[PDB]
Amino acid sequence: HDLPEGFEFMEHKVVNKDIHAPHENLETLRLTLTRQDEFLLREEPVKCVTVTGTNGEYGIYPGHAYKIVQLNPSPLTVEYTDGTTKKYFVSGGFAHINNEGSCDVNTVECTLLDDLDLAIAEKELAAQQAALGSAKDDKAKSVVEIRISVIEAVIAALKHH
């Protein structure tokens, strides 16, 4: 009796480059954008991806050093080698960058910036501001601040372009 492990059914493993190996010049980055155990892009070759981390923005191009990034509610840009830009907006998650030329961006929610609307964000922001004064306790204030920050980021992303 030996139960399997759910990772055995997934054959698309992660390719980690060895320390003492020759370098390779890459022209494309394999992106893997995921939302709630669902991918929008499957190892798509792209020219670059811009992700807003906690410390600041990161522009990931092929060959970027191995790194882990804790995302914040913000836009995410993907520019293909053709010259086409695709912009999403994420609410949180992580981004794993591999020196072998892969970037796995696993977000709790990743939705097109077009799907978002402006007036809805404005009214929700006003409601949250009104409720902040009437916050039951400190925890409610922090939660309302979180929501207000998310809405402000959404509005800034929309107004930028």
């Binding site: 609410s91 709790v108 929610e109 799907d115 809805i120 929700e124 204030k141 939660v143 929501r147 998310v150």
Partner: protein
């Protein structure tokens, strides 16, 4: 930012962010997106009488955080 000092965990922060993001979605698409944030989960234990005693270990809604 200030939510960590109050004991709020990271997962609850993610849930709040997603709920706000869904609330910011257009009218048409929200019908789909809202299905990924509506709480429909509860904790229960069977008592002697058969009633499903509901637990309060973790809040279900975001306003209860």
């Amino acid at each position: 930012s200030s939510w960590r000092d109050h004991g709020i965990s990271y997962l609850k922060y993610l849930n709040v962010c997603t709920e706000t993001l869904h609330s910011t979605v257009k009218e048409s698409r929200r019908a789909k997106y809202e299905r990924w944030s509506k709480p429909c989960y509860t904790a229960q234990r069977p008592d002697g009488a058969g009633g499903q005693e509901t637990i309060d270990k973790v809040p279900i809604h975001t306003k209860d955080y």
